[PDB]
Amino acid sequence: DDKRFNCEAELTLAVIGGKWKMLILWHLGKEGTKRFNELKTLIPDITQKILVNQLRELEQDMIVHREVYPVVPPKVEYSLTPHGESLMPILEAMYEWGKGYMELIDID
Amino acid sequence: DDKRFNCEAELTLAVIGGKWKMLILWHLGKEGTKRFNELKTLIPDITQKILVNQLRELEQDMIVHREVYPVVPPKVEYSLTPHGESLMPILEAMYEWGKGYMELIDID
Protein backbone atom coordinates (compact mmCIF):
# COMPACT_ATOMS: atom_id res chain seq x y z
CA ASP A 1 0.00 0.00 0.00
CA ASP A 2 2.53 2.64 1.23
CA LYS A 3 5.22 0.91 -0.91
CA ARG A 4 2.65 0.71 -3.77
CA PHE A 5 1.93 4.48 -3.56
CA ASN A 6 5.69 5.23 -3.38
CA CYS A 7 6.96 2.85 -6.09
CA GLU A 8 4.28 4.13 -8.47
CA ALA A 9 4.47 7.90 -7.86
CA GLU A 10 8.25 7.64 -8.10
CA LEU A 11 8.05 5.78 -11.42
CA THR A 12 6.08 8.72 -12.80
CA LEU A 13 8.71 11.18 -11.58
CA ALA A 14 11.45 9.14 -13.24
CA VAL A 15 9.65 9.15 -16.63
CA ILE A 16 9.00 12.93 -16.80
CA GLY A 17 11.95 14.14 -14.74
CA GLY A 18 14.81 16.28 -15.90
CA LYS A 19 15.38 19.54 -17.75
CA TRP A 20 13.51 18.97 -21.04
CA LYS A 21 11.09 16.01 -21.10
CA MET A 22 8.12 17.92 -19.71
CA LEU A 23 8.56 20.64 -22.35
CA ILE A 24 8.89 18.09 -25.19
CA LEU A 25 5.76 16.33 -24.00
CA TRP A 26 3.94 19.63 -23.55
CA HIS A 27 4.50 20.64 -27.19
CA LEU A 28 3.54 17.21 -28.48
CA GLY A 29 0.34 17.13 -26.43
CA LYS A 30 -0.77 20.70 -27.07
CA GLU A 31 0.27 21.14 -30.68
CA GLY A 32 0.39 17.58 -32.00
CA THR A 33 2.81 15.70 -34.19
CA LYS A 34 6.21 17.27 -34.79
CA ARG A 35 9.37 16.56 -36.74
CA PHE A 36 12.73 16.74 -34.95
CA ASN A 37 13.69 20.14 -36.42
CA GLU A 38 10.36 21.58 -35.35
CA LEU A 39 10.98 20.56 -31.75
CA LYS A 40 14.55 21.86 -32.00
CA THR A 41 13.23 25.29 -33.04
CA LEU A 42 10.53 25.29 -30.29
CA ILE A 43 13.20 24.60 -27.63
CA PRO A 44 16.07 26.86 -28.68
CA ASP A 45 18.29 26.13 -25.67
CA ILE A 46 18.43 22.38 -26.41
CA THR A 47 21.27 20.79 -28.37
CA GLN A 48 20.83 18.20 -31.11
CA LYS A 49 22.54 15.56 -28.95
CA ILE A 50 20.32 16.26 -25.92
CA LEU A 51 17.07 16.38 -27.91
CA VAL A 52 17.99 13.06 -29.59
CA ASN A 53 18.74 11.50 -26.17
CA GLN A 54 15.50 12.80 -24.55
CA LEU A 55 13.31 11.66 -27.46
CA ARG A 56 15.05 8.28 -27.49
CA GLU A 57 14.37 7.82 -23.77
CA LEU A 58 10.76 8.95 -24.16
CA GLU A 59 10.33 6.48 -27.02
CA GLN A 60 11.93 3.59 -25.11
CA ASP A 61 9.67 4.44 -22.21
CA MET A 62 6.59 4.18 -24.48
CA ILE A 63 5.64 7.83 -23.94
CA VAL A 64 6.55 9.10 -27.45
CA HIS A 65 5.86 7.36 -30.73
CA ARG A 66 8.43 7.80 -33.52
CA GLU A 67 7.11 6.89 -36.97
CA VAL A 68 9.04 6.87 -40.26
CA TYR A 69 6.87 7.64 -43.28
CA PRO A 70 8.43 6.60 -46.63
CA VAL A 71 6.64 9.30 -48.61
CA VAL A 72 8.19 12.00 -50.84
CA PRO A 73 10.45 13.26 -49.14
CA PRO A 74 10.50 10.80 -46.24
CA LYS A 75 9.77 12.19 -42.83
CA VAL A 76 10.03 11.09 -39.20
CA GLU A 77 7.22 12.26 -36.93
CA TYR A 78 7.08 12.27 -33.13
CA SER A 79 3.83 12.14 -31.17
CA LEU A 80 2.46 11.07 -27.85
CA THR A 81 1.40 7.49 -27.15
CA PRO A 82 -1.79 6.98 -25.12
CA HIS A 83 0.46 6.77 -22.01
CA GLY A 84 1.97 10.09 -22.95
CA GLU A 85 -1.45 11.64 -23.48
CA SER A 86 -2.52 10.68 -19.96
CA LEU A 87 0.51 12.55 -18.58
CA MET A 88 -0.82 15.79 -20.02
CA PRO A 89 -3.31 16.59 -17.16
CA ILE A 90 -0.47 16.01 -14.74
CA LEU A 91 1.85 18.40 -16.59
CA GLU A 92 -0.97 20.96 -16.84
CA ALA A 93 -1.51 20.81 -13.07
CA MET A 94 2.21 21.01 -12.38
CA TYR A 95 2.46 24.15 -14.51
CA GLU A 96 -0.52 25.76 -12.81
CA TRP A 97 0.85 24.90 -9.37
CA GLY A 98 4.35 26.12 -10.16
CA LYS A 99 3.04 29.36 -11.67
CA GLY A 100 1.40 30.21 -8.35
CA TYR A 101 4.35 28.94 -6.32
CA MET A 102 6.88 30.96 -8.32
CA GLU A 103 4.91 34.13 -7.61
CA LEU A 104 4.96 33.24 -3.91
CA ILE A 105 8.71 32.79 -3.80
CA ASP A 106 9.55 35.66 -6.16
CA ILE A 107 7.49 38.43 -4.57
CA ASP A 108 7.96 37.00 -1.06
CA ASP B 1 5.70 31.40 -22.50
CA ASP B 2 7.80 28.26 -23.26
CA LYS B 3 10.33 29.42 -20.60
CA ARG B 4 7.34 30.22 -18.30
CA PHE B 5 5.89 26.69 -18.72
CA ASN B 6 9.36 25.14 -18.17
CA CYS B 7 10.54 27.26 -15.21
CA GLU B 8 7.24 26.64 -13.44
CA ALA B 9 6.73 22.90 -14.09
CA GLU B 10 10.36 22.35 -13.09
CA LEU B 11 9.90 24.28 -9.84
CA THR B 12 7.12 21.86 -8.94
CA LEU B 13 9.36 18.87 -9.67
CA ALA B 14 12.09 20.32 -7.45
CA VAL B 15 9.68 20.76 -4.49
CA ILE B 16 8.22 17.21 -4.53
CA GLY B 17 11.19 15.35 -5.99
CA GLY B 18 13.25 12.68 -4.33
CA LYS B 19 12.73 9.42 -2.48
CA TRP B 20 10.41 10.44 0.39
CA LYS B 21 8.71 13.85 0.03
CA MET B 22 5.74 12.59 -1.96
CA LEU B 23 5.06 9.90 0.65
CA ILE B 24 5.35 12.37 3.55
CA LEU B 25 2.97 14.74 1.81
CA TRP B 26 0.61 11.89 0.94
CA HIS B 27 0.21 10.87 4.58
CA LEU B 28 -0.23 14.45 5.74
CA GLY B 29 -2.87 15.16 3.09
CA LYS B 30 -4.82 11.93 3.42
CA GLU B 31 -4.63 11.35 7.16
CA GLY B 32 -4.02 14.83 8.55
CA THR B 33 -1.74 16.20 11.22
CA LYS B 34 1.06 13.95 12.45
CA ARG B 35 3.85 14.02 15.00
CA PHE B 36 7.38 13.09 13.91
CA ASN B 37 7.28 9.60 15.47
CA GLU B 38 4.00 8.87 13.73
CA LEU B 39 5.53 9.66 10.34
CA LYS B 40 8.61 7.64 11.27
CA THR B 41 6.42 4.59 11.95
CA LEU B 42 4.38 5.11 8.72
CA ILE B 43 7.60 5.15 6.66
CA PRO B 44 9.66 2.35 8.21
CA ASP B 45 12.54 2.53 5.72
CA ILE B 46 13.33 6.17 6.55
CA THR B 47 15.99 7.17 9.07
CA GLN B 48 15.58 9.85 11.72
CA LYS B 49 18.20 12.02 10.00
CA ILE B 50 16.54 11.74 6.58
CA LEU B 51 13.00 12.36 7.88
CA VAL B 52 14.25 15.45 9.78
CA ASN B 53 15.99 16.74 6.61
CA GLN B 54 12.93 16.12 4.35
CA LEU B 55 10.51 17.76 6.80
CA ARG B 56 12.88 20.70 7.24
CA GLU B 57 13.07 21.21 3.47
CA LEU B 58 9.30 20.89 3.11
CA GLU B 59 8.84 23.45 5.89
CA GLN B 60 11.37 25.89 4.40
CA ASP B 61 9.60 25.48 1.09
CA MET B 62 6.26 26.44 2.71
CA ILE B 63 4.68 23.06 1.90
CA VAL B 64 4.58 21.70 5.50
CA HIS B 65 3.64 23.62 8.62
CA ARG B 66 5.46 22.70 11.85
CA GLU B 67 3.70 23.95 14.99
CA VAL B 68 4.90 23.63 18.59
CA TYR B 69 2.06 23.40 21.10
CA PRO B 70 3.11 24.16 24.72
CA VAL B 71 0.42 21.94 26.25
CA VAL B 72 0.89 19.03 28.68
CA PRO B 73 3.12 17.28 27.44
CA PRO B 74 4.27 19.61 24.66
CA LYS B 75 3.95 18.33 21.14
CA VAL B 76 5.15 19.27 17.66
CA GLU B 77 2.67 18.68 14.85
CA TYR B 78 3.29 18.62 11.11
CA SER B 79 0.59 19.40 8.54
CA LEU B 80 0.17 20.66 5.03
CA THR B 81 0.05 24.37 4.22
CA PRO B 82 -2.49 25.50 1.61
CA HIS B 83 0.34 25.16 -0.98
CA GLY B 84 0.88 21.61 0.16
CA GLU B 85 -2.83 20.84 -0.03
CA SER B 86 -2.94 21.93 -3.67
CA LEU B 87 -0.17 19.43 -4.46
CA MET B 88 -2.42 16.58 -3.39
CA PRO B 89 -4.41 16.27 -6.70
CA ILE B 90 -1.09 16.18 -8.49
CA LEU B 91 0.26 13.39 -6.27
CA GLU B 92 -3.03 11.49 -6.65
CA ALA B 93 -2.78 11.67 -10.44
CA MET B 94 0.88 10.67 -10.39
CA TYR B 95 0.03 7.60 -8.32
CA GLU B 96 -2.83 6.63 -10.61
CA TRP B 97 -0.65 7.10 -13.69
CA GLY B 98 2.28 5.18 -12.25
CA LYS B 99 0.04 2.32 -11.10
CA GLY B 100 -1.05 1.77 -14.69
CA TYR B 101 2.44 2.33 -16.07
CA MET B 102 4.03 -0.14 -13.66
CA GLU B 103 1.62 -2.82 -14.81
CA LEU B 104 2.59 -2.04 -18.40
CA ILE B 105 6.29 -2.40 -17.76
CA ASP B 106 6.01 -5.33 -15.34
CA ILE B 107 3.77 -7.64 -17.36
CA ASP B 108 5.22 -6.42 -20.68
Author numbering:
A (entry chain A), B (entry chain A): 5 to 112
What do the study's own words say?
The crystal structure of wild-type HxlR without DNA and FA treatment (HxlR-WT) was also solved to 2.6-Å resolution. Both FA-treated and -untreated HxlR adopt an overall topology similar to the previously reported MarR/DUF24 family proteins that bind DNA in a dimeric form, with each monomer consisting of dimerization domain (helices α1 and α5) and winged helix-turn-helix (wHTH) DNA-binding domain (helices α2, α3, α4, and β-strands). Our study on the FA-sensing transcription factor HxlR revealed that FA induced a specific intrahelical crosslinking reaction between residues Cys11 and Lys13. The resulting methylene bridge (Cys-CH2-Lys) on HxlR’s helix α1 caused unwinding and rotation of its N-terminus (“N-terminal helix-flipping”) that allosterically rotated its DNA-binding domain with enhanced DNA affinity and transcriptional activation. Taken together, we confirmed that HxlR uses a gain-of-function, intrahelical crosslinking mechanism between its N-terminal residues Cys11 and Lys13 to sense FA and trigger the transcriptional responses.
